Amino acid sequence: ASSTNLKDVLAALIPKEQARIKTFRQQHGGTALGQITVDMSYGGMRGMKGLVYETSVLDPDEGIRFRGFSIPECQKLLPKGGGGEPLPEGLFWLLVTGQIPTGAQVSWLSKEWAKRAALPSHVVTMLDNFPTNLHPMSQLSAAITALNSESNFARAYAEGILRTKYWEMVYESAMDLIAKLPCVAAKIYRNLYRAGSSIGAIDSKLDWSHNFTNMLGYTDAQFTELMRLYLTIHSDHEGGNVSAHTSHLVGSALSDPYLSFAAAMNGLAGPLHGLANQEVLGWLAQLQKAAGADASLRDYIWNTLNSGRVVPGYGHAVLRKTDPRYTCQREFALKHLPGDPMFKLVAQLYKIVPNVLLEQGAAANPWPNVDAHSGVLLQYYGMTEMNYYTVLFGVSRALGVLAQLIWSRALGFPLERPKSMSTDGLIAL
Amino acid sequence: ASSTNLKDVLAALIPKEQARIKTFRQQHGGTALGQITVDMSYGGMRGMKGLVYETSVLDPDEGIRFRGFSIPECQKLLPKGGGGEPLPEGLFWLLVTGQIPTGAQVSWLSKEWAKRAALPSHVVTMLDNFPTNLHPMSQLSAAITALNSESNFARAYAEGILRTKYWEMVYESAMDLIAKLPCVAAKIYRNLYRAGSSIGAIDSKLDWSHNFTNMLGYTDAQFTELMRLYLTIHSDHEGGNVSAHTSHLVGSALSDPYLSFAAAMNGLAGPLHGLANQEVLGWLAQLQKAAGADASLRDYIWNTLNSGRVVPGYGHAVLRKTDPRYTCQREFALKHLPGDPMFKLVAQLYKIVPNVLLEQGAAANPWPNVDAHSGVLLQYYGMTEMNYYTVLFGVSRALGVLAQLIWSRALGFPLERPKSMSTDGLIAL
Ligand SMILES: CC(C)(COP(=O)(O)OP(=O)(O)OC[C@H]1O[C@@H](n2cnc3c(N)ncnc32)[C@H](O)[C@@H]1OP(=O)(O)O)[C@@H](O)C(=O)NCCC(=O)NCCSCC(=O)O
Ligand SMILES: CC(C)(COP(=O)(O)OP(=O)(O)OC[C@H]1O[C@@H](n2cnc3c(N)ncnc32)[C@H](O)[C@@H]1OP(=O)(O)O)[C@@H](O)C(=O)NCCC(=O)NCCSCC(=O)O
Ligand SMILES: O=C([O-])CC(=O)C(=O)O
Ligand SMILES: O=C([O-])CC(=O)C(=O)O
């Protein structure tokens, strides 16, 4: 009997995994997986195997994998709206479950996220009174924190539920949060950039991305395709990245999914992290201010470097090759906006930057990351408000971080609480 | 020539340390400080030496140290208001600098934090419109996020300053943030619990704690002493704790001090972390509802345990003995409120809980932590709104987390970005 329900699937899946991690540990918990050095400690855990995070794994050479699904595999395997890009809905199923969803599963997420998309009065109010000089990421983060009012997990906890059921309430709050996100984000968009206009209604019959673009006010049929791709690729990037790790850390203390997501956003807002989005365009924007020669392009790069600044959109803590998320984006531009001068500049930079970065001899990875390519795509379609880009990153990232969050709690992962040391104490060790 | 200035002191101190960490690393960066096991990965980094954090170090047996200054040492060494408890101002100097401040240094922090204490209009507005069912911690966190508008670091960064000067702007924003905190917190207090009343003005001539208590509306001369002690002891607890670690992680991405503090708060708000504050009182509050026997006291404890719940205020990730912060508090009660029935219940529990926890055989540390003792103190003085307690914890914690934050940036600590693994991948390793 019956029809589609992610929660039931999960109910079936949890005990097996539980069982599976127990024996593994019973046999191997004692096993040394690595060592910790002094440089690692001073170095931001660089190179330390610190967390279990199941939804995605980053290979330094190959790049991100969703099951063991690469981006190009996703692109072919995940259901599409009709009509060439993968629906972030399907990605979400994939991440949660480990399996490739059917079109019909996918429709279910769509409807589910449409049903759940509703904003409480206090939230709307706060967003409506925010100053226009308050950054969109700040606006977003405060809004999601303020939504915790509504937390199903925070409520069940307060009621004294057995730990065993945590995942259940986490799941509800995750689905709800993902559902609301586009409304919050679009409301910020509309307030800042389209004063006096309204986000309108969510239509149950559309996919999440399309409802988002409607609320954003974009009609271009290719913009919608761009959106689907964007929100899919920005999903997740393993556990060690600042935003995911923050959610993981905060979630471990049993703060609800809203609070943990919001802290994650404060992390995504940092220039070395998601804000790179924005930083890239601002830098391109300056570049152009000051059709240039490779030599003048190179002078420009050196001047940033010589000034004690980073070249945004290049480098990576883990990647050692060009990010497939970058390629992914380039391949979209080549199809759709090949003559765009911004695009051309970004293509040109790919020829120069890494070479300059190799010359300088500091960056361990001289190749571009996702952020070097995303804004150019947006700007083409009319979305030229750069300080907003990270908000989009923010919306996507919910998909991976919440998908894992549910597992953490299902698996009963404890408080994240490593040991710290001072220099004097290490000196003494 | 001249008078007092923390920033100048720091300017003198930074290069030396810089120098000191460089050679150390030049000789020992390669040195294995420890190993990583499978259980550690699944276990929340339990037992992993993961971070350098200089302001304080936690010993599993002895408990927290400020330089190498214990709580009892602090209590005797740090300047007081006139008149028995240590001023959190002095603690702050201690943490930043490594040295015990003079009364005169201490006065300087006081005046400085009084000068800087001003709330921007949009913040006041938002706080005034917040619903009363929005938790005080949520209210606090959204408020501090919304303050980033004003970030000196976020502004300098945007301007393209050289990395080398980061610490300078971090310091300003830290001093400013610490200054504003009590205004924000008191405003929440006043809105929720004293509708229609106003926080009033900060008086440059008082210490931070006293201005706070005034804004809170408390006149009891002993309440003020309690406050000073509270905000001092709650300061810092090394780097590995959820809140400090979150600030550290978020700060590493170069999100400004406001954003990083706010994320820290989302972490403090979790039940396994600071919210324990509140959880303890709520549990005591229930206990009493349902002058009891040790046997009925024990039945009560088992029922929580059997229900898949934690006994709040007991246990610790790192401590293996009774928290000196607990003793510290007990010693205050014994002096000031020895006949208080809530106090008596908390004294009685200390005789029972750990024994029940030893019986159960799960807790690795069966002894109480700071949170088991703090609320009882507050309730005595009239501050009985338990959902607010974590806000106080929040205010104090700024002291340690911001003191370190400045050093991280001074020392040029990089992005915190460990490697994660999935179970399948570990299975395969
Ligand atoms: C992404 C990174 C933070 C990784 O940091 P890391 O693992 O510590 O880098 P690394 O090991 O190559 O660093 C060695 C040195 O090269 C420097 N370096 C690395 N990338 C860059 C860059 N793009 N421009 C200039 N210098 C750089 C690095 O800052 C350091 O200098 P110093 O020792 O004086 O501090 C870094 O490459 C960077 O700052 N990139 C620019 C900002 C950026 O584009 N961030 C987005 C990252 S990926 C997608 C996302 O997260 O949103
Ligand atoms: C503070 C702690 C999170 C440390 O967690 P940990 O390092 O994973 O604890 P542990 O190593 O003793 O855990 C072994 C087992 O004992 C359980 N245990 C530990 N403390 C408690 C407690 N107070 N009540 C019942 N069970 C407990 C623990 O949850 C676990 O059960 P299982 O294996 O099925 O998940 C924990 O002791 C706890 O949950 N305490 C109650 C909440 C609390 O008071 N938190 C405040 C911590 S200190 C000050 C602050 O941070 O604000
Ligand atoms: O992996 C990282 O450290 C950052 C990154 O590319 C992402 O989070 O998308
Ligand atoms: O050390 C910890 O994990 C928690 C704690 O006591 C604090 O942060 O005050």
For ligand 2, mutation pick of B242, B278, B279, B316 (most atoms within 8 Å of CB): B316
Pair of tokens at residue B81: 């208001």
Chain A nearest CA to B317, separation (Å)? 7
Query: Separation of A406 CA from ligand 4 center, angstroms?
Result: 25
Mutate to test the interface with A, among B419, B423, B427 (most CBs of A within 10 A): B419
**Residue for token digits 């063991």?**
A68
**How many angstroms is the resolution?**
1.9
Q: Across the interface, do B47 and A157 touch by the CB < 8 Å criterion?
A: no
The CA-to-CA distance between both ends of chain A, in Å, stands at 64
Whether A63 and A77 map to the same domain: the answer is yes
Alpha carbon separation from A277 to A58, A137, A372, B279 (Å, rounded)? 20, 12, 7, 41
Contact B231, B209 (CB under 8 A): yes
Pair of tokens at residue A267: 């992390």
What HEC string does chain A produce? CCCCCHHHHHHHHHHHHHHHHHHHHHHHCCCEEEEEEHHHHHCCCCCCEEEECCCCEEECCCEEECCCCCHHHHHHHCCECCCCCECHHHHHHHHHHCCCCCHHHHHHHHHHHHHCCCCCHHHHHHHHHCCCCCCHHHHHHHHHHHHHHHCHHHHHHHCCCCHHHHHHHHHHHHHHHHHHHHHHHHHHHHHHHCCCCCCCCCCCCCCHHHHHHHHHCCCCHHHHHHHHHHHHHCCCCCCCCHHHHHHHHHHCCCCCHHHHHHHHHHHHCCCCCCCHHHHHHHHHHHHHHCCCCHHHHHHHHHHHHHCCCCCCCECCCCCCCCCHHHHHHHHHHHHHCCCCHHHHHHHHHHHHHHHHHHHHCCCCCCCECCHHHHHHHHHHCCCCCHHHHHHHHHHHHHHHHHHHHHHHHHCCCCCCCCEEECHHHHHHC
| Amino acid at site A169 | M
Pair of tokens at residue A294: 């490779």
Determine the 3-state secondary structure of B156 from DSSP: helix
Largest CA distance in chain B: 69
What are the CB-based long-range contacts (under 8 Å, 24+) for A168-175? A168/A7, A170/A257, A170/A405, A170/A406, A170/A409, A171/A6, A171/A7, A171/A10, A171/A406, A173/A256, A173/A257, A173/A258, A174/A257, A174/A402, A174/A403, A174/A405, A174/A406, A175/A6, A175/A112, A175/A113, A175/A116
Nearest atom in ligand 2 to the alpha carbon of residue A412 is 35
Q: Is A309 one of the annotated binding-site residues? A: no
Q: Across the interface, do B134 and A148 touch by the CB < 8 Å criterion?
A: yes
Neighbouring C-alpha atoms within 13 Å toward the C-beta of A25:
15
Please indicate, yes or no, if residue A427 is contained in any of the structural domains: no
Alpha carbon separation from A310 to A277, A365, B138, B161, B410 (Å, rounded)? 13, 13, 34, 11, 17
Output Rg (C-alpha) for chain A, integer angstroms.
22
- The H or E element containing residue B145 is helix B136-146
Please indicate, yes or no, if residue A383 is contained in any of the structural domains: yes
Q: Across the interface, do A250 and B239 touch by the CB < 8 Å criterion?
A: no
Residue nearest to atom 7 of ligand 4 (CA): B237
Contact A259, B242 (CB under 8 A): no
Whether B248 and B299 map to the same domain: the answer is no
β-strand pairing of B49-52 with B63-65 = unpaired
Query: Separation of A372 CA from ligand 1 center, angstroms?
Result: 13
Whether B404 and B289 map to the same domain: the answer is no
- The H or E element containing residue B34 is strand B32-37
Whether A298 and A314 map to the same domain: the answer is yes
Contact A270, B408 (CB under 8 A): no
Report the distance separating Cα A139 and Cα A69, nearest Å.
34
Contact A375, A330 (CB under 8 A): no
CA B350 from chain center: how many Å?
A: 23
Determine the 3-state secondary structure of B242 from DSSP: helix
Neighbouring C-alpha atoms within 13 Å toward the C-beta of B193:
21
Determine the 3-state secondary structure of B49 from DSSP: strand
Q: How many CB pairs under 8 A join A and B?
A: 396
Query: Separation of B322 CA from ligand 4 center, angstroms?
Result: 13
User: Comparing C-alpha atoms, which of A129, A222, A138 is closest to residue A390?
Assistant: A138
Whether B42 and B179 map to the same domain: the answer is yes
Q: What is the DSSP string of B66-130?
A: SSS--HHHHHHHS-B----SBPHHHHHHHHHHSSPPPHHHHHHHHHHHHHT----HHHHHHHHH-
DSSP structure class, residue B273: T
Mutate to test the interface with A, among B31, B250, B254, B369 (most CBs of A within 10 A): B250
- Is A234 among the residues known to form the active site? no
Contact A50, B45 (CB under 8 A): yes
Mutate to test the interface with B, among A420, A421, A424, A429 (most CBs of B within 10 A): A420
Please indicate, yes or no, if residue A44 is contained in any of the structural domains: yes
Report the distance separating Cα B30 and Cα A360, nearest Å.
24
Nearest ligand, CA of residue B53? 4
Chain A nearest CA to B53, separation (Å)? 5
Alpha carbon separation from A23 to A19, A335, A416, B361 (Å, rounded)? 7, 49, 22, 21
**At CA B197, angle to CA B191 and CA B199, rounded to 5?**
80
For ligand 2, mutation pick of B241, B369, B373, B392 (most atoms within 8 Å of CB): B369
The CATH number that applies at residue B51 is 1.10.580.10
A32 closest CB neighbour out of B35, B273, B425: B35
- Strand residue runs (E) in B196-340: none
**Residue for token digits 């890239």?**
A280
Pair of tokens at residue A110: 């769509």
Quick check: B142 contacting A, CB < 8 Å? yes
What HEC string does A288-301 produce? HHCCCCHHHHHHHH
User: Comparing C-alpha atoms, which of B405, B415, B417, B315 is closest to residue B366?
Assistant: B315
Whether A58 and A127 map to the same domain: the answer is yes
Neighbouring C-alpha atoms within 13 Å toward the C-beta of A329:
26
Task: Print burial letters for A107-117: b (CB count within 10 Å at least 16), e (below 16).
Answer: bbbbbbbbeeb
Q: Is the CB of B313 under 6 A from ligand 2?
A: yes
Alpha carbon separation from B367 to A417, B201, B371, B397 (Å, rounded)? 18, 42, 11, 22
Please indicate, yes or no, if residue B429 is contained in any of the structural domains: no
CA A100 from chain center: how many Å?
A: 20
For B260, counting Cβ atoms within 10 Å of its Cβ (0-12 exposed, 13-18 middle, 19+ buried), the class is: buried
User: Comparing C-alpha atoms, which of B165, B20, B212 is closest to residue B98?
Assistant: B20
For B297, counting Cβ atoms within 10 Å of its Cβ (0-12 exposed, 13-18 middle, 19+ buried), the class is: middle
The CATH number that applies at residue A311 is 1.10.230.10
B53 closest CB neighbour out of A262, A422, A427: A422
Please indicate, yes or no, if residue A428 is contained in any of the structural domains: no
User: Comparing C-alpha atoms, which of B94, B78, B97 is closest to residue B86?
Assistant: B78
Quick check: A206 contacting B, CB < 8 Å? no
Report the distance separating Cα A179 and Cα A88, nearest Å.
12
Q: What is the DSSP string of B171-219?
A: HHHHHHHHHHHHHHHHHHHHHHHSTT-------TTS-HHHHHHHHHT--
The dihedral over CA atoms of B164, B165, B170, B176, expressed in degrees to the nearest 10, equals 170
Contact A403, A90 (CB under 8 A): no
Quick check: B364 contacting A, CB < 8 Å? no
Nearest atom in ligand 2 to the alpha carbon of residue B318 is 7
Quick check: B303 contacting A, CB < 8 Å? no
User: Comparing C-alpha atoms, which of A13, A176, A188, A35 is closest to residue A95?
Assistant: A13
Show the domain range for A190.
1-275+388-419
For B30, counting Cβ atoms within 10 Å of its Cβ (0-12 exposed, 13-18 middle, 19+ buried), the class is: exposed
Whether B328 and B188 map to the same domain: the answer is no
Q: Which residues line ligand 3 (CB under 6 A)?
A: A 237, 241, 243, 317-318, 369-370; B 417
Contact B332, B380 (CB under 8 A): no
Alpha carbon separation from B393 to A19, A250, B378 (Å, rounded)? 39, 16, 12
Quick check: B286 contacting A, CB < 8 Å? no
| Discontinuities after residues in chain B (C–N over 2.5 A) | 82, 290
Nearest atom in ligand 1 to the alpha carbon of residue A274 is 52
Report the distance separating Cα A285 and Cα A345, nearest Å.
11
Report the distance separating Cα B64 and Cα B144, nearest Å.
27
Report the distance separating Cα A270 and Cα B252, nearest Å.
8
Instruction: Name the active-site residue from A273, A336, A340, A373.
Output: A273
Please indicate, yes or no, if residue B428 is contained in any of the structural domains: no
Report the distance separating Cα B395 and Cα B141, nearest Å.
11
Number of domains in chain B: 2
User: Comparing C-alpha atoms, which of B167, B145, B146 is closest to residue B157?
Assistant: B167
β-strand pairing of A63-65 with B63-65 = unpaired
**Residue for token digits 């009239």?**
B382
Contact B236, B399 (CB under 8 A): yes
- Which segments of B are annotated as binding site for oxaloacetate? 325, 397, 417
Contact A226, A381 (CB under 8 A): yes
Determine the 3-state secondary structure of B315 from DSSP: coil
Whether B282 and B266 map to the same domain: the answer is no
β-strand pairing of B32-37 with B57-59 = unpaired
CA B238 from chain center: how many Å?
A: 10
Whether B300 and B412 map to the same domain: the answer is no
Contact A189, A216 (CB under 8 A): yes
Report the distance separating Cα B272 and Cα B137, nearest Å.
15
User: Comparing C-alpha atoms, which of A267, A149, A230, A342 is closest to residue B259?
Assistant: A267
Determine the 3-state secondary structure of B348 from DSSP: helix
Please indicate, yes or no, if residue B406 is contained in any of the structural domains: yes
Q: What are phi and psi of A248, to 5 degrees?
A: -65, -50
Report the distance separating Cα B414 and Cα A335, nearest Å.
37
Residue B57, strand partner residues: B65
Q: Across the interface, do A420 and B239 touch by the CB < 8 Å criterion?
A: yes
Contact B228, B85 (CB under 8 A): yes
Determine the 3-state secondary structure of B419 from DSSP: strand
Alpha carbon separation from B27 to A70, A386, B164, B407 (Å, rounded)? 41, 45, 24, 22
**Residue for token digits 């790919």?**
A350
- The H or E element containing residue B355 is helix B341-360
Pair of tokens at residue A290: 């000051």
- Is B316 among the residues known to form the active site? yes
Please indicate, yes or no, if residue B426 is contained in any of the structural domains: no
Quick check: A429 contacting B, CB < 8 Å? yes
**At CA B355, angle to CA B354 and CA B356, rounded to 5?**
90
Q: Which residue is closest to B250 within chain A, CA to CA?
A: A267
Contact B315, B363 (CB under 8 A): yes
Contact A418, B240 (CB under 8 A): yes
A176 Cβ contact list (under 8 Å, min separation 6): A116, A150, A152
Whether B112 and B199 map to the same domain: the answer is yes
Output Rg (C-alpha) for chain B, integer angstroms.
22
Quick check: A364 contacting B, CB < 8 Å? no
Pair of tokens at residue A97: 């479950």
User: Comparing C-alpha atoms, which of A366, A282, A371 is closest to residue A326?
Assistant: A371
Alpha carbon separation from B192 to A216, B142, B147, B270 (Å, rounded)? 36, 16, 20, 21
Q: Is A87 left (phi over 0), alpha (psi -120 to 50) or beta?
A: beta
Alpha carbon separation from B271 to A255, B60, B339 (Å, rounded)? 7, 22, 29
Alpha carbon separation from A410 to A171, A374, B86 (Å, rounded)? 10, 34, 44
User: Comparing C-alpha atoms, which of B414, B158, B187 is closest to residue A46?
Assistant: B414
Instruction: Name the active-site residue from A207, A256, A371, A373.
Output: A371
Report the distance separating Cα A362 and Cα A351, nearest Å.
18
Pair of tokens at residue B48: 């992993």
Whether B86 and B142 map to the same domain: the answer is yes
Q: Which residues line ligand 1 (CB under 6 A)?
A: A 46, 272-274, 276, 305, 310-317, 362-365, 369-371; B 412, 414-415
Chain B nearest CA to A232, separation (Å)? 20
A179 Cβ contact list (under 8 Å, min separation 6): A112, A113, A114, A115, A116, A117, A118
| Discontinuities after residues in chain A (C–N over 2.5 A) | 82, 290
Contact A253, B273 (CB under 8 A): yes
- Is A273 among the residues known to form the active site? yes
Whether A59 and A161 map to the same domain: the answer is yes
Contact B326, B318 (CB under 8 A): no
Pair of tokens at residue A54: 């199941």
